[PDB]
Amino acid sequence: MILDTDYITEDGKPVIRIFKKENGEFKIEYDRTFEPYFYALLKDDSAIEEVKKITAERHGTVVTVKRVEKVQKKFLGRPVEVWKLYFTHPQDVPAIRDKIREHPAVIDIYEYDIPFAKRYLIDKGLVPMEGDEELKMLAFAIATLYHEGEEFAEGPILMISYADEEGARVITWKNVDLPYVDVVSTEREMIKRFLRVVKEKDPDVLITYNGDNFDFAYLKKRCEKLGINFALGRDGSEPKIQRMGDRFAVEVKGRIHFDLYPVIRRTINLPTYTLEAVYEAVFGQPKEKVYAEEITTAWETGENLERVARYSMEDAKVTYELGKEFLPMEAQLSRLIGQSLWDVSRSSTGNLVEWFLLRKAYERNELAPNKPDEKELARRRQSYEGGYVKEPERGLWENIVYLDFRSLYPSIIITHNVSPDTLNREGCKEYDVAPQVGHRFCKDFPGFIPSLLGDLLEERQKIKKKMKATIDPIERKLLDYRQRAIKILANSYYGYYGYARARWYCKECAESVTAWGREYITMTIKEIEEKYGFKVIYSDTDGFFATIPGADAETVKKKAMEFLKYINAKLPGALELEYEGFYKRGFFVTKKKYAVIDEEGKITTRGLEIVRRDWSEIAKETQARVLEALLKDGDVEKAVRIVKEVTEKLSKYEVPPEKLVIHEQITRDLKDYKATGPHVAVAKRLAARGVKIRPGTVISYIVLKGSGRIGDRAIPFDEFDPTKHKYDAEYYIENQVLPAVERILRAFGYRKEDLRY
DNA sequence: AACTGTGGCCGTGGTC
DNA sequence: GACCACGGCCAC
Numbered sequence: 125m126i127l128d129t130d131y132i133t134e135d136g137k138p139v140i141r142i143f144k145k146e147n148g149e150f151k152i153e154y155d156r157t158f159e160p161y162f163y164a165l166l167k168d169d170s171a172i173e174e175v176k177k178i179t180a181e182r183h184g185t186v187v188t189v190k191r192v193e194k195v196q197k198k199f200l201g202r203p204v205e206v207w208k209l210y211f212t213h214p215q216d217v218p219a220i221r222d223k224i225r226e227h228p229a230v231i232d233i234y235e236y237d238i239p240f241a242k243r244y245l246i247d248k249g250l251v252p253m254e255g256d257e258e259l260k261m262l263a264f265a266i267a268t269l270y271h272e273g274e275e276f277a278e279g280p281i282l283m284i285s286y287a288d289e290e291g292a293r294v295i296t297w298k299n300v301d302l303p304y305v306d307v308v309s310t311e312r313e314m315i316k317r318f319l320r321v322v323k324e325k326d327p328d329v330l331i332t333y334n335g336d337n338f339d340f341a342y343l344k345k346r347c348e349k350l351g352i353n354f355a356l357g358r359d360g361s362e363p364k365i366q367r368m369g370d371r372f373a374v375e376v377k378g379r380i381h382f383d384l385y386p387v388i389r390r391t392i393n394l395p396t397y398t399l400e401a402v403y404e405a406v407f408g409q410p411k412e413k414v415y416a417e418e419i420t421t422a423w424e425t426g427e428n429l430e431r432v433a434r435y436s437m438e439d440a441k442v443t444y445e446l447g448k449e450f451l452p453m454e455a456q457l458s459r460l461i462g463q464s465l466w467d468v469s470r471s472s473t474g475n476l477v478e479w480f481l482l483r484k485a486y487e488r489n490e491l492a493p494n495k496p497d498e499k500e501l502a503r504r505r506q507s508y509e510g511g512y513v514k515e516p517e518r519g520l521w522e523n524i525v526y527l528d529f530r531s532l533y534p535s536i537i538i539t540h541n542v543s544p545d546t547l548n549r550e551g552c553k554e555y556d557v558a559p560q561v562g563h564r565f566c567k568d569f570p571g572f573i574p575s576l577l578g579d580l581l582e583e584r585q586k587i588k589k590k591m592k593a594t595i596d597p598i599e600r601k602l603l604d605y606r607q608r609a610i611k612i613l614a615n616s617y618y619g620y621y622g623y624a625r626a627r628w629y630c631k632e633c634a635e636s637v638t639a640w641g642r643e644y645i646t647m648t649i650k651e652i653e654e655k656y657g658f659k660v661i662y663s664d665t666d667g668f669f670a671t672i673p674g675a676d677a678e679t680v681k682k683k684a685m686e687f688l689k690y691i692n693a694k695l696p697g698a699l700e701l702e703y704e705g706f707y708k709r710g711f712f713v714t715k716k717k718y719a720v721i722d723e724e725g726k727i728t729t730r731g732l733e734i735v736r737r738d739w740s741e742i743a744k745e746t747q748a749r750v751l752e753a754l755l756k757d758g759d760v761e762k763a764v765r766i767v768k769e770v771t772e773k774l775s776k777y778e779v780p781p782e783k784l785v786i787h788e789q790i791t792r793d794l795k796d797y798k799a800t801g802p803h804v805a806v807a808k809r810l811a812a813r814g815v816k817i818r819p820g821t822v823i824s825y826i827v828l829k830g831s832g833r834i835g836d837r838a839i840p841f842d843e844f845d846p847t848k849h850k851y852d853a854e855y856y857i858e859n860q861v862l863p864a865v866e867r868i869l870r871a872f873g874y875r876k877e878d879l880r881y
Numbered sequence: 882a883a884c885t886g887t888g889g890c891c892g893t894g895g896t897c
Numbered sequence: 898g899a900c901c902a903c904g905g906c907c908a909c
């Protein structure tokens with residue numbers, strides 16, 4: 125299989141490198157013949173002789189057109205012949221493309237900003253990660269000496285650990301009496317030893333947890349101090365550290381640096397993404413954390429080093445175990461997009477969609493539309509109406525079924541052929557007309573994007589059917605994550621239509637999709653209420669909760685299955701209403717906030733404070749105990765006692781202050797905030813002390829006793845000292861606990877006054 | 882992480 | 898007090 129491709133320049137000419145593993149052997153294939161290009165649409169074929177003469181300059185190098193060939197293409201499905209303009213070197217294209225577009229004989233140009241190595245994979249029909257090849261994998265981690273106030277990597281690496289199918293080991297330069305610890309003379313020899321190990325094992329995949337932003341940058345700084353050529357690459361190169369967005373990413377050439385952190389972060393929803401949290405969520409086993417402060421004290425005092433080495437060994441071990449499960453999931457996605465695992469595992473959803481569409485467009489002889497310029501971008505900044513959200517029938521309900529459309533927005537795109545190459549096309553035999561907004565879509569031929577969603581959706585449902593039949597609960601989660609990733613990808617094609625930077629931008633398409641969605645869900649609600657006697661309790665976009673007032677569970681389930689047969693026979697094309705589940709009881713608070721319990725006793729909660737990273741644990745813990753007392757024990761008096769116990773404890777300063785921490789993300793430069801909430805107030809006091817506040821910084825603060833603005837008396841939890849600081853017990857009662865639980869216990873006749881003291 | 886999309890709750894600190 | 902805009906995170 126193909127692992128990666130890139131290009132190097134040799135005597136001014138590009139050379140593609142294809143990193144392969146075949147029959148257990150690593151190979152590098154070199155292609156010297158592939159040429160960069162873009163397309164020009166000319167006013168007349170005779171003008172090509174002029175265009176061939178246009179020249180540019182880049183760094184004292186004259187740029188010329190190497191050669192041309194005329195080709196038949198389609199633009200949004202309409203045939204058109206264009207000139208493929210070839211060049212000697214990819215950098216020629218940025219240097220000359222404006223001069224060609226400016227030529228009076230040139231109407232427009234296309235596909236002039238495609239990275240060369242990806243262009244090669246598309247045009248050659250090559251797909252990374254295809255085949256039965258078994259890849260060898262190696263995880264690694266590091267332990268460092270840390271002191272507050274120091275620069276990054278001023279202190280040495282203390283241990284380097286690595287794990288694979290054969291076990292886990294730790295390299296260190298102090299004497300630790302553990303069988304898996306290899307003792308070397310110095311930090312320098314420890315790094316050189318790890319390098320030796322990577323070259324001996326020759327792994328196809330290096331697995332880290334956040335190596336993109338910590339491990340490799342730390343190693344590089346230390347290797348710069350120590351004079352080490354850290355040649356982990358299979359071509360003898362050192363790791364290649366590149367900016368990517370607001371952070372960095374690291375390649376190791378000829379292998380795949382698989383950083384688990386970007387994958388996990390976008391696949392699993394956790395409050396924190398410490399390695400220990402991730403391990404426990406995936407495998408159901410605890411992992412102990414040893415903190416930087418303990419590690420430094422152990423190294424300097426020479427005591428309890430065995431515990432640090434064990435912690436370091438366990439980091440590599442669980443990092444290997446995780447990579448073994450998540451690599452095949454991301455390899456599948458890599459095959460579906462047609463790009464390397466390295467790119468796909470780190471890329472925004474927009475880039476995944478666009479790379480997929482560029483390959484498919486090449487397969488179908490379709491020219492890609494261009495990315496918008498600044499002025500077109502400003503023109504694309506109007507919003508449009510979305511899904512319908514019904515105001516819920518508040519309170520406790522029994523014997524609830526949940527019905528929900530299968531992949532609704534993609535199914536609408538498929539069924540009604542919603543696409544910019546079909547929008548208001550004239551002269552067709554058949555049209556579908558979007559409700560409310562009136563846009564017409566021709567049905568005589570499959571639209572570009574509609575024609576591609578079907579395979580995604582059919583793949584997803586195969587995974588879903590296997591998921592629901594999987595005994596192994598770990599394997600079941602992993603299938604869940606796969607089918608969810610395809611779901612979001614498919615839905616992102618709809619969002620792509622309304623994305624201002626999209627090449628296949630079409631706002632008419634996007635608002636037609638949502639308009640159809642609104643008409644389908646309200647029609648479905650009308651039918652189930654009118655013709656089957658249901659009451660719809662709550663509905664959001666494409667699903668709803670409903671019951672038959674006064675009927676038992678068996679009756680509600682039976683009549684819901686009858687309604688599904690009836691409604692699906694009336695729905696056109698790929699539109700299908702699904703049975704998602706039955707809940708013995710449910711409590712609906714507001715739009716987007718409710719909790720249901722199934723017949724096995726499992727509670728599911730949506731939108732409520734329990735699921736929000738930005739509410740205090742004491743409020744979430746209390747709300748969770750209350751929901752359990754209500755939905756599971758049907759015990760209202762108990763839920764009330766729980767609240768009363770909590771408020772009393774808070775009043776008496778008996779709640780641990782850890783449960784009172786509030787977490788809120790900084791999303792922008794501090795200068796750009798118009799409204800200064802508590803987390804920005806704290807952030808501005810830290811910045812004034814020299815702390816590097818950037819977008820993505822989480823502020824973790826606690827509210828101290830006082831009266832005025834909350835931000836005036838919020839401090840970071842780092843600075844909280846229980847001997848000097850009294851937390852604001854009234855704030856956590858009146859601003860956190862009570863609001864969270866009173867919105868629920870109102871339904872049973874309890875005012876806040878009934879829950880205080 | 883997200884810049885694939887819109888809808889929505891709710892705390893906060895302002896206005897009057 | 899009533900009201901509003903901002904900003905975060907969440908449900909689709």
Ligand SMILES: Nc1ncnc2c1c(C#CCNC(=O)COCCO)cn2[C@H]1C[C@H](O)[C@@H](COP(=O)(O)OP(=O)(O)OP(=O)(O)O)O1
Nearest residue numbers: 528529530531532533534611612615616619665666730909
């Ligand atoms: N990321 C998105 N980008 C653009 N549009 C999006 C989404 C998005 C989502 C999500 C992920 N959340 C979950 O998976 C569950 O997490 C809940 C935890 O609180 C929903 N929509 C739109 C299009 C979609 O057809 C419609 C109905 O939604 P929804 O029935 O769930 O999906 P669906 O009908 O396609 O798929 P299924 O029913 O699963 O078959 O809303």
Ligand SMILES: [Mg+2]
Nearest residue numbers: 528664666667
């Ligand atoms: Mg839904």
Ligand SMILES: [Mg+2]
Nearest residue numbers: 888889903904
């Ligand atoms: Mg908003």
Ligand SMILES: [Mn+2]
Nearest residue numbers: 528529530531
């Ligand atoms: Mn759905």
